[PDB]
């Protein structure tokens, strides 16, 4: 909540991967100072000889970028009494650490998680290629300010796209097709060989998610564990 | 998948294909999947008394396939056996392991809480459909993540999360019971409604998009 | 300078922990102040693990 | 008036899920021309996964576009096939 | 430190490398109007049909720039009695020596210590590809102004790259190895072509950190030795 | 390399390998790294008593490779066997010349401080593990730096930084010995958590992150 004189105002505080698994989670003693948010669509015009053209392909990466300056006079912290030369430190060190550890193309972890405790709002975000340009002028010499740029890979409401659990109803791990490849494994050089040349008979006499209930994916399974337990031929066929 | 649909006053039988699909020309299919004879759909409830099952009438309740099963025959099949049960082919059938909801609920995030029950006679009790999402809901957001003893990441952090009673940590809350409930691909999402902060009781209350 | 034709190349990647060797058929310098100063190393016949 | 355009691509592989091949789809080409005796296709790929180690050789993709918006009930709704081959 | 609650801060010192051995140090009187350290990341972000990919290769170089000026009252020094004017010439002298005789002659040092001591923090820079610029201005008739760009190399606090010492357990030549070729150059014609021949006939027919502790990285070297001096055939194999 | 464990109250052996590298398939070749006869983790150690050397009980070391030398057959039968000898190899053993402790300690910087010393009998001393390192860090950091007669760029300017005792002098004080530390590989950093003046004395004192 904004003060609004029906509640006091709350800050902005960000989630960190903590290197031996769980977080950190650091919070801001002053509110930025600038505030953008920026929603480009992936919207192309192209115009024709009598025609225009209107073709758009949906949402595109957001930009969250602010600016804001730490307090100078001591504040209390909740294990601590830290000064606002050390918060600003503490910031520059984490977001080198989340930075550097990023050599492996990406974190397997976590992204940063964005608290919006100004505005009701959540976002998963990275590191922009902007950065955390910091600086300090003349004007205000004992006040820090800092940039911070991000873009938003998702809501934070959702969990992540490939570690959905999906149904996986009946058996995704059929036992026929590794017993076949067992039986197959085990059958001798000249036992594969007809059953190759039974293959190619069969393909020459062409012409001139899986369950054992309702469902018909699985008939190949059932019919190539069989021809081997049965000795359909010299080896199995399919 | 599919939709439900509850039969109208004099509703055309053309008028519920063209209504749902656009074109009027698939009604034969859609007739098909619901193993009606001719007589689709009739005013007077007297006369479904002759052939029930093959004869629909007002406010009775048809099945609506989506586009792409209209022409499988398998699915028309099995579309013919489920009839208003196909619920249950999506969310599914599980054993009961809720024994008595006034127990765990009173003991929380532990070891040595829930347990396989019988509901009846000698048939052990497998519970289903909406109430195996119930289920299936309940017993994944009280397993800590870490948890169980393959497939790991299930579960939730939640009982890391008993913090400070202050708003922010509230919220965590909140974002964990929402990653923790839209990870499994039978809710399309979730939001929060409400929260309430006692002195030292959270209480929220959460929606989700159940399929179908 | 080190590469030259006809050496066997040595390739550990760090993105994932994985290696790779390679035969060297062709290498292009190119060195100019305008920017910075690259070597080409065409390989052929390459494979994995090491 | 102006025609609105909402593309939505599908790709369908037959031998690693196909649907979810089709999901880090970013753009490709398909050279089909009678001039020549050969007809050639290319398919750009994200760098989300390792790609190199999935897709073996030879295997069958399947391409799918949607032209315009689904409800509108419009001709261009077919998913018409545009090309398939051999990788 | 800053001018709060401590004691005074200190200014800002550049390290440079002295030619005959040693070091050579220069403190700004004055410090500087303008302070900006620049870090980006190297990180794209490109959207696919339904989903976002993000990638990241690592941290990007930290671009420091600050503007200052020289004051126009002497002050004490080490030795001497230098006013701005001789700073500032000292300065691009320093410079000069730094970067004109860089990429020719030689110069000893490899990087640059940049100390902050009003920020705490050190880094170690190289000159950018902008590089110095000094301008004078109307309404300065008595003083000097510069501006410099630099680009962090590393963090101070780590060593070397060529003063980096590895782990090295065990022998690091493999003495059989190195003696085998010893051994080698005195052979005889035939010995070498007959060594070539049994190579050649094992091969053709194969498919149907030196430490012997903790370790079986260095068998066949010591065979070759044993093979060569013993002899197992005319002049070895492998 | 390795990562060390200790068994937990009726912690199944499944546990370790699922929790560490992810499946639990692996606990199968994570066994004979331990050389564990077959009831591989065991609560009580009055059955541990049964043999004591080929078993692990409640309270008891356990070792964790990394998933590289996991596969490695000379990592398994190097670990099944060295067991706590593994820390002493792994970071080396030579001779230990901190024969005066008291001594070398009175006037560092310059030279013949050191001396070979004798332990045990008839053998001279050495040194293994975490104390090779306390000496060779020691010993290395009052050297000057091109004063071996090969390998020189090895030590340190300490010996060239006596100064005013103004903080300038103090932090390249700190910048040298950081980098002095530093420069082993087997050690991941060093950093500064006091410095400290008392006139013409210098003191302070450096965190160093030594690899597992």
């Given at each position: 909540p904004q003060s609004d004189g029906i509640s006091n105002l709350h800050r902005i505080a960000l989630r960190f991967p903590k290197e031996g698994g769980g977080y950190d989670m650091y919070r801001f003693k002053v509110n930025p100072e600038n505030y953008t948010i920026d929603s480009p669509q992936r919207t192309t015009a192209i115009k024709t000889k009598s025609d225009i053209v209107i073709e758009d392909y949906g949402k595109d990466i957001e930009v969250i970028n602010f600016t804001g300056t730490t307090g100078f006079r001591p504040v209390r912290e909740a294990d601590g009494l830290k000064t606002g030369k050390q918060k600003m430190e503490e910031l520059q060190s984490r977001v080198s650490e989340y930075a550097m550890q990023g050599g492996s193309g990406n974190v397997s972890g976590s992204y940063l998680q964005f608290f919006n405790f100004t505005d009701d709002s959540y976002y998963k975000v990275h590191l922009a290629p902007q950065g955390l340009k910091i600086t300090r002028s003349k004007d205000e010499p004992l006040l820090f300010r800092y940039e911070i740029t991000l873009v938003v890979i998702?809501?934070?409401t959702e969990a992540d796209r490939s570690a959905v659990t999906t149904e996986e109803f009946g058996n995704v791990k059929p036992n026929a097709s590794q017993r076949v490849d067992e039986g197959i494994k085990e059958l001798d050089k000249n036992a594969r060989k007809t059953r190759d040349r039974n293959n190619q008979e069969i393909s020459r006499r062409e012409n001139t998610i899986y369950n054992p209930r309702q469902s018909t994916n699985g008939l190949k399974g059932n019919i190539d564990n069989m021809a081997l337990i049965i000795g359909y031929g010299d080896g199995g066929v399919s | 998948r599919f939709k439900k649909h509850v039969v109208q006053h004099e509703e055309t039988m053309q008028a519920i294909a063209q209504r749902y699909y656009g074109d009027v020309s698939y009604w034969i299919d859609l007739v098909e999947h619901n193993n009606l004879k001719y007589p689709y759909l009739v005013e007077t409830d007297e006369e479904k008394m002759k052939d029930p099952e093959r004869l629909a009438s007002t406010g009775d309740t048809l099945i609506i396939p989506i586009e792409?099963?209209?022409?499988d025959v398998s699915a028309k099949e099995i579309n013919s056996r489920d009839k208003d049960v196909l619920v249950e082919l999506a969310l599914g059938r599980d054993l009961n392991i809720t024994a008595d909801e006034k127990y765990f609920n009173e003991h929380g995030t532990s070891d040595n809480i829930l347990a396989f029950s019988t509901n009846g006679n000698g048939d052990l009790d497998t519970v289903k459909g909406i109430d195996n999402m119930k289920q299936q809901l309940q017993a994944r957001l009280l397993t800590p993540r870490g948890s169980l003893m393959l497939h790991p990441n299930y579960g939730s952090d939640l009982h890391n999360l008993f913090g400070l009673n202050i708003p922010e940590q509230a919220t965590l809350i909140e974002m964990e019971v929402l990653r923790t409930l839209t990870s499994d691909n039978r809710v399309k999402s979730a939001n929060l409604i409400d929260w309430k902060i006692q002195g030292n009781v959270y209480s929220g209350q959460f929606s989700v998009e159940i399929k179908s | 300078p080190k590469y030259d034709l006809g050496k066997r190349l040595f390739i550990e990647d760090k993105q994932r922990g994985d290696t790779w060797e390679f035969y060297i058929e062709s290498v292009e310098h190119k060195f100019d102040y305008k920017q910075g100063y690259y070597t080409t190393v065409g390989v052929t016949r390459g494979l994995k693990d090491a | 008036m102006r025609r609105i355009r909402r593309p939505k691509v599908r790709i369908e592989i037959v031998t690693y899920n196909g649907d979810e091949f089709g999901a880090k789809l970013l753009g490709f080409q398909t050279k089909n021309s009678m001039e020549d005796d050969s007809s050639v296709f290319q398919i750009n790929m994200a760098g989300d996964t390792y790609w190199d180690k999935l897709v073996m050789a030879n295997d069958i993709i399947r391409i799918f576009i949607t032209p315009n918006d689904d409800p509108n009930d419009k001709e261009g709704k077919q998913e018409r096939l545009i090309q398939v081959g051999m990788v």
């Open positions: 998702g809501s934070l | 792409s099963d209209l022409t | - | -």
